[PDB]
A paper describes a structure:
Succinyl-CoA reductase (SucD) is an acylating aldehyde reductase that catalyzes the NADPH-dependent reduction of succinyl-CoA to succinic semialdehyde (SSA). In these fermentations, succinate is first activated to succinyl-CoA, which is then reduced to SSA by SucD before being further converted into 4-hydroxybutyrate. In these enzymes, the respective acyl-CoA enters the active site, where the acyl moiety is transferred onto an active site cysteine, leading to a covalent acyl-cysteine intermediate.
We addressed this promiscuity by solving the crystal structure of a SucD of Clostridium kluyveri in complex with NADP+ and mesaconyl-C1-CoA. Our structures at a resolution between 2.1 and 2.2 Å (re-)confirm catalytically active residues and residues necessary for the coordination and binding of mesaconyl-C1-CoA. Each monomer has an extended C-terminal loop that reaches into the second subunit within the complex.
Residue numbers in the entry:
A (entry chain B), B (entry chain A): 5 to 453
Write the structure that this text describes.
């Protein structure tokens, strides 16, 4: 049960797996996703119970969506041997595994993340060792167990998926340093560790999705989408909506649309502070309300919130560090802010990203494509989600984001990529470079002219 | 000036630089390359004198080629703002700077590497802080100085390029940890510290280019290309040819082609050992002969080598660890080995990559594309250079490799990329994801069928 034994088992498995063809890894990869789809109800109930956060019905939808969207995305992708011919540059591209993947998986998505990481790794003839969050180790282990059971029935090499029980940080550090490539999906601490391991690493960053509602947009649809995303899994998703940046001239109209769709809006300064003092203790999120219901938060705050309320919306004191409510809230609570111009809406969003979450996701609800493009152009984000719930940032059958459970945050979030992690990031792509003799020696004028 | 003050001045510069348009960074980038082109003769002379390695004429050609090939490649690349529209996936792509680049530069390419890194950085609206090798600090600083003079003439903001005047230790470590993104072009130690800094890094592993001469190929042309690559800058290029894996049935022919083209071939065991004991001390390369002439090496070995000899070729005792000569040699010396079958030739090259240089470059000289494709599929290399000097792996006007002075070695070499570093690796590419309404919710059979 030592790390060095797990690494050694993984190398032996990887060599066996490296002999697989494209079609043969595709069989295993499809089965890994389908077992999470087929057992979504059992996994979802186990996750909610063990991690003490989230919503059963949303984790069922998450398992259904992630497994099917990832497989549908990667089923026709060429990741074995020669994958591309490019005669115009006299190049031939070859896909080769990176080897053994070390993957640290979060408490918020303890089922789909080992599944996603395993599917991406095995798709490129890599093997993987999962190290789960301690508060989710059982359901993560159970996911690995049922994945390994389907691999055995298909004749897969033993131990292409392993999992460590003890989250001993001496053993977790040793695992990242001993593996060929590291995936860290979790908090800022586990991400910095991956990028200090001396090995090529793919991490994530804390989210803090800012949302601009543009003037004249259908506020009813905007409110429905923002509420759908904020309340999903009790708000623990990294892409979840965190703020409502609304136009001053239509502010009451926007709030009314949220109220019409299940929000409880708090304007009174003293009543907001009752929530604020509950959600944050000494500037840090109160772990007791992470992924909890609206009513749990209301009772701890001592505020009566109507039955049926889907999200709480709190009027904020101001953008950025003017209000701790502008930090990431892993619960169904939004902070509302006003703007006079779209430029001010962007600056408010940017101030909150500088506070927390730079490089992740933003949402926008607008019929003004020039404003959308300006926001995409200037905001410190990897993903801008337009006119849909921001939780679709990780993939949906109605947008073009690459399906994943590991959302890169770029240099802002101190990650290596500013995009969703896929199979592509776990294979080396070699180049065979031929000689093009029918090419002349360009002169000084041709180069510098 | 302290690193903390360098980082601050750089961040101020980048904010001013972020407002630049595509055309405005292009003017700066071009002038950076052209000032190294126009001063190639002066820089080459200073580099040979200060670093006490290399060849003046080769450094002039290096400066001329790298500067012109990089500009010619990146002149028309879109790296600012919205760079691509993909309506089939309802996506729009946005290029954004990563911020402040920390770039450590090597003793072997002290002029072109600061140039190439600065061009790639500023092309994506980044700023850069160069940490040169101590044995090349003067000429690297001189390169930065003349580059900054061309920037000022064009009206660029102050300090978009800076250089650390001090060497390593806490300063270089603090720089890599404090910057947004790190480039490490150098030895295994600098690559390791880059991937341990807690920041996204790009490294370059040690090279050890294995070369297979295939049966029936024009051995005269192969010898000319291999000698050209091996002798360039006295053998200090990381892509430089290091071995001659030749068919046993034609071995004397191949050697004869080498001798005909300026090689001195040593078959006698005791005479080879005179060279071997000079080139390697205790299994490590003798730093006194790094980038030195054939005659300096011959004099130290006490072996008479004819005047005009271009390279020395030593018959190796065997593949891999059977001979220290199979390691990387940063000097104009090759190790010769025999093979009975092409499959065995690949195995020999494989064993030498396991000894040193896995993930870098190989060369092959062949008209049999099946053999070329087999070698490129089996070998742990990011680049396979066909029928040309292996030193063209960093780019040439006659192949498709992206021009660079920073050649990543993939996961094999403990790097994040298995390709040549370009502007692309220094921008965050973001995605605007619109909502596609026409798509319908897929059924189970439509997902898993
Ligand atoms: N971008 C994405 O794709 C994505 C996916 C999931 C979550 N996230 C983000 O990550 C955060 C959630 O991560 P989490 O929900 O896993 O909780 P967490 O934020 O990782 O914090 C977990 C707590 O337990 C510690 N901890 C974490 N992993 C541990 C381990 N293996 N062994 C021992 N202690 C450990 C952490 O300390 P350290 O500081 O030492 O970790 C921290 O105190 C949210 O901010 C969310 O937005 C992002
Ligand atoms: N793939 C590429 O694009 C590329 C480009 C250039 C060079 N290379 C590879 O790099 C190797 C040569 O690199 P080099 O010629 O620059 O010498 P080096 O091997 O990078 O370092 C040489 C010696 O200098 C020491 N050193 C002391 N202070 C240093 C400092 N401030 N920065 C760096 N090293 C310092 C190093 O210690 P540490 O152990 O702490 O480094 C090492 O012992 C060759 O193997 C070559 O193939 C690859």
């Amino acid at each position: 049960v030592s790390i060095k034994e797990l690494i050694e088992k993984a190398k032996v498995a990887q060599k066996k797996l490296e002999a697989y063809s494209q079609e043969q890894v595709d069989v295993l990869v499809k089965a890994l996703g389908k077992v999470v789809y087929d057992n979504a109800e059992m996994f979802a109930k186990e996750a909610v119970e063990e991690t003490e956060m989230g919503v059963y019905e949303d984790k069922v939808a998450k398992c259904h969506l992630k497994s099917g969207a990832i497989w549908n995305h990667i089923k026709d992708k060429k990741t074995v041997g020669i994958i591309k011919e490019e005669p115009e540059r006299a190049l031939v591209y070859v896909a080769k595994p990176k080897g053994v993947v070390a993957a640290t998986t979060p408490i918020t998505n303890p089922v789909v993340t080992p599944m996603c990481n395993a599917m991406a790794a095995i798709k490129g003839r890599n093997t993987i060792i999962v190290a789960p969050h301690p508060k989710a180790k059982k359901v993560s282990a159970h996911t690995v167990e049922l994945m390994n059971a389907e691999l055995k029935k298909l004749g897969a090499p033993e131990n292409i998926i392993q999992i460590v029980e003890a989250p001993s940080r001496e053993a977790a550090k040793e695992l990242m340093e001993s593996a060929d490539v590291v995936i860290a999906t979790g908090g800022a601490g586990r991400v910095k560790a991956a990028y200090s391991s001396g090995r090529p690493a793919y991490g994530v960053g804390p989210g803090n999705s800012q949302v601009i509602v543009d003037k004249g947009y259908d506020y009813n649809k905007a409110a429905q989408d923002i509420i759908t995303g904020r309340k999903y899994d009790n708000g623990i998703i990294c892409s979840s909506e965190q703020s409502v940046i609304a136009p001053a001239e239509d502010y009451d109209k926007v709030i009314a649309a949220f109220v019409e769709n299940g929000a409880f809006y708090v304007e009174d300064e003293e009543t907001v502070e009752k929530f604020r003092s509950t959600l944050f203790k000494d500037g840090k999120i109160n772990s007791k309300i992470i992924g909890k219901s609206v009513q749990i938060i209301a009772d701890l705050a001592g505020v009566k919130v109507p039955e049926g309320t889907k999200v709480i919306v709190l009027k904020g004191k101001g953008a950025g560090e003017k209000d701790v409510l502008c930090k990431e809230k892993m619960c169904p609570v939004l902070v509302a802010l006003k703007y006079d111009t779209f430029e001010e809406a962007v600056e408010i969003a940017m101030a909150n990203y500088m506070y927390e979450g730079a490089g992740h996701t933003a949402g926008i609800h607008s019929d003004n494509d020039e404003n959308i493009r300006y926001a995409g152009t200037v905001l410190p984000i990897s993903r801008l989600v337009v006119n849909q719930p921001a939780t679709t940032a990780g993939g949906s059958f109605n947008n073009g984001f690459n399906p994943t459970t590991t959302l890169g945050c770029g240099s802002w979030g101190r990650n290596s990529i500013s995009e969703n992690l896929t199979y592509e990031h776990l294979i080396n792509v070699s180049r065979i470079g031929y000689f093009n003799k029918e090419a002349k020696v360009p002169s000084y004028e041709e180069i510098w002219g």
